[PDB]
């Protein structure tokens, strides 16, 4: 009964390759070569936001494009103000080992997880005035790795339980459970309609969910190492995903496949954040390095290199208005580059 | 709207100012405590050295017990709510002071998964400059292995047969050689692997331990002194 | 997509000799480091071998060792096992594990219970 399940999956799995390769007309470079490229873009490091005590392993913007939180290992969760490089809030964790930060759209609260496999949501605009924990959601078996919120009081979380749950923050309960990784979660990203999520995981597959109906619509092969980061195009039709295998990937959903690959020779190190520009045509991609890559995504050519900190890239993300890209590192430093 | 402006730009100063405050108090009580990461197998007996010095010392997925001898803080983590996977979460340990590794010296089966576990740690690109503080646990049910003699480690190790007692070894009073033979044998299994790369940049500190070791806390106290004293020496320039 | 498919087992009276191979695809085979799994019937899964990017670092576990030898041939993308004067204690099932990441020194979780790159399994049944 096993062999004959397992003769049924590689016949589907040779009947999914050769659709793709029916669909595959054209390449993107060979549609792309007439682009004008992007040139080289130099971007300056404007601020550096400093306090941090440990290694920052992840960072978010707010919707206003003026806000930003961030996470360190010293359990602390400090919100600035990236204009003024001020820092509005600290949050002081339970557990120091925090791995993922959250941003709510509309403010008013901010979440963070890791080791302790609880994502911890914090209330800010408080009639108290002082951040405090507003839920504990306890429902994951593994290690938070990263958190995101359709809303208030809705969190897509994903864990190293080869799993992703959506979350009710009023009821601190999982709404939907998100199965069919073999591997660790390591990111997920929105899309913009927020309907949809696709999340990277460590056996080198992404996956297309569905927020409400509740099921992989469809998987995402061609990484050859863990996938560590995974972000949007800014339309809902592409996504971007970096692994350990030195290469970003550009999938796009209604092809069901792979665009084009971002890879040099030179580069042997792993890929930890990868987020667009407003327009989508800048890749830029965190690295072991201790420096960031920005890619032209239609022509996979490093256009510039972010290269300001000392210890690897561990977080990597542009504003809403897509004015600055904001990098963190385990060099307990951010810093905003434009 | 600049007078409203105003107003608004010295409040978030004094945010500042409170978060500057706070922030430079818990980094002094950062530094003072020195972040211990507990690793090892199900029968490796992390535990009972967790529990040795929250009974006989200071004492959800993570086991914290925070210990202090000699007026130092100690941070031990115990990382158990987790998968079998561990090549994600465990970059999260690449500022610890130190790592202890807990090994059953007399599960002869999985000291190859100890072993490969410890090479990974000592080879991996985020750990490969922190110092591992290496426990040979369950010295008593190994001395009474050897003596029994129904399990040889020959099977499971064939250079074994090959092998010769140190003269740098110091048996116990009331020790058997063929203890002794055995002990130090799986100590130079670790020490070999450590020995094999990490520079000067990683060092790896063998003890032998017991479920009635008393002594533990007092040896990740010396050697996290020889781990800080070593990153002194080339913070300050004398190496 | 990453698939480890290994080929080779069977029923081999003790003393035989079988080679396991492991047709790899999906990735750079000449970037990672290879291992030889095995799941003994109710035993957990035990590391037997591994090998390096090249066919140098060839280290095996102390059960195997002198009668075991794994070879890697980066050209035809196959990982070998040649096991000789076989043991019944030798019955279990055979995985070809690779490394997480490439051009690394350390193998994390490849004895784990469930490992993305491990491969389904060839089993070896000496008696």
């Known amino acids: 009964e096993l062999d004959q399940l397992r003769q049924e999956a590689e016949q589907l799995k040779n009947q999914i390759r050769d659709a793709r390769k029916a669909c595959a007309d054209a390449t993107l470079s060979q549609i792309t070569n007439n682009i004008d490229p992007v040139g080289r873009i130099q971007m300056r490091t404007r601020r550096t936001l400093r306090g941090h005590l440990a290694k920052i392993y992840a960072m978010h913007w707010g919707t206003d494009s003026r806000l930003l939180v961030s996470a360190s290992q010293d359990g602390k969760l400090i919100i600035w103000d990236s204009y003024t490089t001020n820092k509005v809030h600290a949050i002081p964790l339970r557990s120091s080992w925090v791995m993922t930060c959250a941003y709510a759209p509309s403010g008013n609260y901010v979440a963070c997880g890791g080791l302790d496999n609880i994502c911890s949501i914090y209330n800010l605009k408080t009639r108290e005035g002082n951040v405090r924990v507003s839920r504990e959601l306890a429902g994951h078996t593994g290690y938070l790795s990263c958190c995101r919120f359709l809303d208030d009081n809705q969190i897509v979380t994903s864990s190293g339980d080869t799993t992703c749950a959506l979350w009710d923050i009023e009821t601190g309960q999982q709404t939907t459970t998100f199965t069919g990784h073999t591997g660790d979660v390591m990111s997920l990203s929105l899309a913009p309609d927020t309907r949809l999520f696709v999340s990277g995981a460590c056996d080198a597959s992404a996956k297309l969910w569905d927020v409400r109906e509740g099921m992989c619509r469809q998987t995402f092969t061609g990484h050859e190492s863990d996938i560590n980061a995974i972000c949007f195009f800014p339309n809902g039709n592409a996504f971007a995903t970096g692994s350990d295998d030195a290469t970003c990937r550009l999938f796009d959903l209604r092809a069901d496949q792979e665009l084009m690959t971002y890879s040099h020779d030179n580069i042997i190190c792993g890929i930890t954040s990868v987020s667009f520009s407003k327009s989508g045509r800048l890749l830029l991609a965190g690295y072991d390095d201790f420096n960031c890559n920005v890619w032209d995504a239609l022509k996979a050519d490093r256009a510039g290199v972010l290269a300001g900190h000392d210890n690897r890239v561990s977080c990597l993300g542009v504003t809403d208005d897509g004015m600055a890209v904001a990098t963190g590192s385990w060099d307990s430093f951010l810093k905003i580059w434009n | 709207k600049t007078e409203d402006q105003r107003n608004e730009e010295k409040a978030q100063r004094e945010a500042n100012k409170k978060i500057e405050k706070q922030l430079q108090k818990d980094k002094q009580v950062y530094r003072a405590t020195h972040r211990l990461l507990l690793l090892g197998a199900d029968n490796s007996g992390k535990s009972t050295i967790v529990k040795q010095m929250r009974i006989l010392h200071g004492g959800s997925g993570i086991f914290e017990t925070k210990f202090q001898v000699d007026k130092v803080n100690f941070h031990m983590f115990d990382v158990g709510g987790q998968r079998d996977e561990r090549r994600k979460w465990i970059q999260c340990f690449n500022d610890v002071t130190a790592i202890i590794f807990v090994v059953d010296s007399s599960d002869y089966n999985r000291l190859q998964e100890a072993l490969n576990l410890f090479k990974s740690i000592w080879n991996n690109r985020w750990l490969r400059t922190i110092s591992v503080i290496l426990f040979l646990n369950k010295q008593d049910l190994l001395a009474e292995k050897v003596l029994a003699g129904k399990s040889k480690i020959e099977d499971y190790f064939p250079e074994f047969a090959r092998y010769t007692t140190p003269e740098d070894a110091t048996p116990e009073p009331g020790e058997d050689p063929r203890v002794t033979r055995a002990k130090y044998f799986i100590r130079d299994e670790f020490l070999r692997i450590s020995t094999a790369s990490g520079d000067g940049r990683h060092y790896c500190y063998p003890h032998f331990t017991c479920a009635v070791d008393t002594e533990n806390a007092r040896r990740i106290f010396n050697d996290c002194r020889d781990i800080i004293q070593r990153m002194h020496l080339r913070q300050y320039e004398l190496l | 997509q990453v698939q480890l498919q290994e080929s080779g087992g069977g029923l081999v009276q003790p003393g035989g000799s079988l080679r396991l191979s492991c047709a790899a695809s999906?990735?750079?085979?000449?970037?990672?480091?290879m291992n030889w799994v095995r799941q003994a019937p109710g035993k957990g899964l035990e590391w037997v071998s591994d090998?390096?990017?090249?066919?140098?670092?060839?280290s095996y576990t102390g059960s195997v060792k002198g009668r075991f030898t794994i070879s890697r041939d980066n050209a035809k993308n196959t990982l070998y096992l040649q096991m000789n004067s076989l043991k019944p204690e030798d019955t279990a099932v055979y995985y070809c594990?690779?490394?997480?990441?490439?051009?690394?020194?350390?193998?994390?979780?490849?004895?784990?219970?469930?490992?993305?790159?491990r491969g389904q399994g060839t089993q070896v049944t000496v008696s």
């Open positions: 090998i390096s990017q090249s066919g140098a670092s060839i």
């Open positions: 999906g990735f750079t085979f000449s970037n990672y480091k």
């Open positions: 594990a690779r490394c997480p990441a490439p051009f690394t020194r350390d193998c994390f979780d490849v004895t784990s219970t469930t490992y993305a790159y």
